[PDB]
Amino acid sequence: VMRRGEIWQVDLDPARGSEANNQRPAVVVSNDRANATATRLGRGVITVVPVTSNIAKVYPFQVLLSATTTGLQVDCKAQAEQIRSIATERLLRPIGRVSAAELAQLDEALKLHLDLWS
């Protein structure tokens, strides 16, 4: 049981170059039928958007996540340009859930970054 919108701590190592690395929170963004399939076999993959506490300059393909509603300890930003499909074994520990507003803007960021305007 993992669901779209949930924030999990995930293990991204090893990484190369500007790829998000270390262990960090990430938002599940794959659909829940795929999530259910991945949990079924046990293996399978799920797609997540990594999160960083280094807010700095926020781009239109990135979304500010509130520590107050997510369970995070500080406000972070989800980087849609770092989207990654991961083996379920990289899931470490659940932290929380994004609001509906935050998730909707993350759908917008994904559509922008991947040029999915239709």
Added chain:
Amino acid sequence: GPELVMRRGEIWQVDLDPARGSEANNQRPAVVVSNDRANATATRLGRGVITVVPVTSNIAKVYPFQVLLSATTTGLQVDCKAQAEQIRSIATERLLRPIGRVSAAELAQLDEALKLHLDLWS
């Protein structure tokens, strides 16, 4: 190695290792799906991250989140299928060489597969 001129829809050979579980692994073709503003930025800076869809020649069953890619037009040596469920942002340091490009109809199917997989509507 290569000059970083990758653009959306192109097929490039990329190094995905090391990988865990069902993650697409080793060096294999993948389809560039990140927007060309970001890709051109990566060209200008000579570094960045490029979002790709890895490819497998194990056709088997083509699910709605996967797209059949023909050997005739891609420059691939056999028919392959793009796996939207394996979408991954990768360092430009992982790009090995350009292979070719998918057709516009194939890229449109890949757009639909991505929207399906990531639960997006437009």
